[model samples]
Target: QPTDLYFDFLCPYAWRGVEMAHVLRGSGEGFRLRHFSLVQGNHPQNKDQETVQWWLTDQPLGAEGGSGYMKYQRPSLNAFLAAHAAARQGEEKSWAFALALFRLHHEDKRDLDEAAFQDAATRAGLDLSQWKQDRQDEAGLRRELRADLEAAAALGVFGTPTFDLGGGDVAYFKFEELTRDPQAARDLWNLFTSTLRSEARVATIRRPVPK
Candidate 1:
């Protein structure tokens, strides 16, 4: 069975989730990484501003929307579109491209831009010309993200790096450290997935620190 994993590129934990999925893929486990908007999540004013649907507007993602409550970060949008663009080439290219972006942003702390995405696309073995053509359709690209946003909203998703482990079992997961090692990631992925799927009664687990 495939897991539908929701994430926003702006979230560091989402990076780890993507990383973990990359490792899990080796074992034939299926994962579909989909987008969620951290921008919309942080802003409450979007509810009443139904007329604009600003995230779908054709303006640059960096620009502010009609409502003061909305401002899109260019780099985050860049990351999302880049991944989507890579998918037009093929799924492997898409996965490689996204993993590269996460490594650059999280491991190297590089603020993503078109230049960084170009370099990543080259490394991911994508056709640069085709990728550029694919990303140019910003209007169409926004629709994909919009679908994901609406899907997440329908499910009442509250956080990034959430795992939807079939049959409406969705859980927001957070973990410490970037678990890149194959064995370690497998151990954690298996443990986490099994627990979240099987132990439905244990709703939340928050570790406490003694003062």
Candidate 2:
């Protein structure tokens, strides 16, 4: 069964999810990547603690000094827009573009502005003229983007990094549960997939109370 993931490029949590998806690819599990913008109207509030936790948990070792988080006033509209265009070419190319954008946004901590998309597109080897024209079709692109969001909303997705395992089995994952190690990644997938195959309607682990 192919897993479907819904995410917005602006989300760090989604960044970890994408990394794990790479692991899934290595493990021979097929997945479909979908885009749903987390930023609609005004930009989301600064996620101070969430950002710090993502850096601590997701950033690779020897990456840099201490943990640091980014704050965005608005979502990466153009990034996702470009993804829609990339998808028109092919799934592999689209995923390549998406991964590039995610790396630039999360790993390099670059601002997801116009320049960032231009740079990422260039690196991803997308047809520059076609990409520029596609991104410029803002009106059509927003409609294309809206479909993904609507589909996710119907599946009760209210956040990024959500997965649909089919038959009303939608699972939400936490950053701490992600791993880069191949064996550990396989273990995590086994556990998550087992739950999806279960009869349980919902499953969750409660956080520990502060001492």
Candidate 3:
């Protein structure tokens, strides 16, 4: 429970980790998931640059095709802003809202412009009026979102799904480890807190830790 989970919506790999975290919770392992708001790859201003780069890098057709990249990411942006909207309400709703939005995009492929977002929000039991207000309120959301991005950068994060698994050892399943071994990706959640807990205990005694 001592570990922190940092992730973003754009990185699909992080969603896999988030799913694994939910799976691990069924085992009754004690861990607190510290969800961090991190943004990686493609900002609104630099979308064209990123699109071209990814196209050159042989990214999926969805990203390289005309406006197709935006099609996938638009929902991600809604989820991002919706997260901030939830944050505006209270801290309790942030995690819940995030998981909800994650499922909407990663699992359902719901478009950002679709009514499903608001529908899903309502289903997740969020305040619809406030969410709508925040989503439509461009000026305020942009400024606040930029600040959040700045804060994330200050933390030295350049990727999605970075885990502060305590004890200075982090497991970046989304970027480095997740793609290689699909099963290993399953360890993402507790992989952080568990490793961090062991590390913290060992740090006290300066010994090699047991997993």
Candidate 4:
């Protein structure tokens, strides 16, 4: 069974989800990384201070950290559109561009503008002409992003970094610290793999505060 990670590039927690996906790949398990944008305007109540702080608490300080703060940070629509464009290169390049963009936004504290994406695209070795043309095509990008949003809606996604652990098991995850712990990472990989293979219908754990 494969893991499906529905994530948004703007969300800090989604960075951790990408980390988890990397770990899963290291364990010789493959997974799919899907796009799910955080449309804050569509969900105003979900953007409380608590949610904002969770994104800022662990970032490094200073140059390595970029601005090292998180508040009303909304990623550019071009960021993901560029991502899908880079994906046209290949799977490895897609993941590479995604990670680079996430690091640029969260760690480097850079703005998610065309220049930033262009840099990441160059680093990811994407076809310059193709990537450039694709990014400039607003209508095409909108259609692609809209399809991702519609798919997330159908999956009942209401947050960034939501996961479908196969076999109908899905949940929102805040695993930055947990994935940092090697033992916990291994345990989670095991459990997640088993759940995907098991005949589970539904599974959930509700925490009072989404940490």
Candidate 5:
């Protein structure tokens, strides 16, 4: 029963999710990563704007003459594109690339731009020219992302770090803290999985903000 985690680059919890998955990978329990673009989902305006997947274009729904709110979402789209491009090289390279991207954005606070992709691909030991060329097939990358977004829709996912718990148990999760301790990470997984598996009826449990 492989767990599929849908993530977005801009979502900090997805970063934590990836980190936890890394620490737990040694136990033969690794997550299959998938994409869910927050930018596409949270369009700032009308249904028309929301209907447009801004990531597919240099000029998004309201990016009139390139003044950008959708511009802010560009790097995130580039990241997913970069990840797919990296995957073309191989899964190992893809993972390294993703891990590097996550660390760069979440830890180092680097911007996810063309430069970031180049840096990540270089560090992942990828052929730079090939990687750049690969990323240029913008339509193909968006097609891949659309399929993932469709999958997310079919799974009733509305957020990043959503896990398809492998038994018709899909759940959204957030880690408030990042853990480096292997045992602690595994322990967190065990408790969360066991609870979800045992109590599939528990639809949601959110800690409300307190005054």
Candidate 6:
């Protein structure tokens, strides 16, 4: 059995989900982390326009998208863009880029897409010239984000940090509600593990009999 951990890069809860998965892995449970995109609000690039179209009246002035909806500060698009560029380069760099963005957005209380992304990308060893050109290629980037969103939707994932313990009875998890309570988190993890075990038992039962 395989444990597939799903996460959306934009969600803080998803970030915690990743951390929790690491803890679970350390507890002798075998699992693999899988990346998944969630359209939490809108594509970070089109965030401003999307917010205006969907929630201009409800949201206060300057509330365009991304962290704009949150009461706290939000970094610029450059932060997430840099992370995206680094992801294209390699998985290891992608994590570094992600951590940097998460820190800037969650802790530093700054714009992620602008200065934060630029600085973090530099630290992550991203190539400036190539990344800059890629950013300017709006059509290409939009296409990529669209494709990622579509793939995520196909998997029945509308939220972030959803875990799929692979099996005929695959279960999905929500990170936001779980992280609030330690006992709830433990119970959820235990239930997830049991689901994996149950799947294994069923697989064994279904195996062909010896000749």
The best candidate in terms of TM-score: 1
Error of 5 at 155 (Å): 1.1
Off by over 4 Å in 3: 1-4, 20-73, 165-171, 175-188, 193-211
Q: Cα deviation of 158 in candidate 5 (Å)?
A: 1.2
lDDT of 4 at 7: 80
Give each model's whole-structure lDDT.
0.76, 0.68, 0.53, 0.67, 0.76, 0.53
- lDDT score of model 1? 0.76
Rank candidates, TM-score, best first: 1, 5, 2, 4, 3, 6
Q: Model 1, range 64-175, lDDT digits (tens) per residue?
A: 4454444445666667877877877876887888888877777877777767787788878899889889888877777777787788777777678998888867888888
Write down the TM-score for model 1.
Answer: 0.86
| Each model's backbone clash number | 0, 0, 2, 0, 0, 14
Per-prediction TM-score to the true structure, in the order listed: 0.86, 0.76, 0.58, 0.73, 0.86, 0.57
Per-residue alpha-carbon lDDT of model 6 for 1-211, expressed as tens digits? 5466655556678777665665455555555444454333443433544222321112332344444444221222223334555666665566566665665666676655567768777776777787777767655554554454444445655466666665444445544452424455566688656755763563212235598
Q: Write the per-residue lDDT of candidate 3 for residues 16-130, one digit (tens) a residue.
A: 6665654454455333333333323443433544222221112221232235434444444455556667767664465566667677766787654446556567656788788
Distance (Å) between predicted and true CA of 90, model 1?
1.8
Residue 207 of model 2 has an lDDT of 79
Which lDDT tens digits does candidate 4 get at residues 1-211?
Answer: 6677888787788887787677667667677778775643234443543332222112221213223232333344556667878877788888889888887878888887767887888877888998878766756666766676667666777787887876566777765552745566678767655654566543654557676
What are the RMSD figures for all models against the true structure?
A: 3.2, 8.9, 9.4, 8.0, 3.3, 11.1
In model 6, what lDDT does residue 147 have? 51
Residue pairs with backbone overlap in model 1: none
Can you tell me which runs of candidate 5 are displaced by over 4 Å? Answer: 44-71
Q: Which runs in model 4 stand beyond 4 Å of their true positions?
A: 40-74, 178-184, 191-202, 209-211
lDDT of 5 by residue, 1-211 (tens): 6688898888889888877887787678867778987766665552344244443333332222234545456677778878888878876787789888888888888887767777787778988888878877877877787788778867867777888977688888887999768999998888778768774567777898899
CA shift of 7, model 1, Å: 1.6
